Amino acid sequence: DFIAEANAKGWIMAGSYFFDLVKLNGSATEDQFDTGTGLDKSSFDPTQ
Amino acid sequence: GTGSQIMGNMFGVFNSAVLALGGIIIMYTLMVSTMNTAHEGQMLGQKWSS
Structure with missing residues (x-):
């Protein structure tokens, strides 16, 4: 589901998706x- | 091989983009060559054949 919102953020924020990409690859x-x-x-x- | 083909699509889109950009460069160099040809008066320069 992240991919769509990634297209909203732009190319600069591509780094923060790394782990997501990994669990996809x-x-x-x-x-x-x-x-x-x-x-x-x-x-x-x-004892009580 | 059988690896993930994201490499293939990435290289293909890079190939298309570089094709378009290089083509724009060929328009630029083509206008350069045509103006040199017009200035000299002989077909497509004098150093290479047509």
């Missing part, structure tokens, strides 16, 4: 488990 040339449960925040103390 790749596309032409080329289970999970819970994280953040917070159960580690729990505490238990028999």
Whole structure:
């Protein structure tokens, strides 16, 4: 989607698109488990 | 090869642009040659054949 707006910015701003271009040039040339449960925040103390 | 042909399109558009610019240069040099031919009186200079 960036290409169109790139044509709006002009030739000077072509540099800032580099990474975008890269992840495009790749596309032409080329289970999970819970994280953040917070159960580690729990505490238990028999001394109480 | 089989690499990305953005090289090919880039070189093609550069070729077309340089063709147009060089052609404008050929108009300029053509007017230069014609005015030299008119001034001298002989066809297309005296150093090269027509």
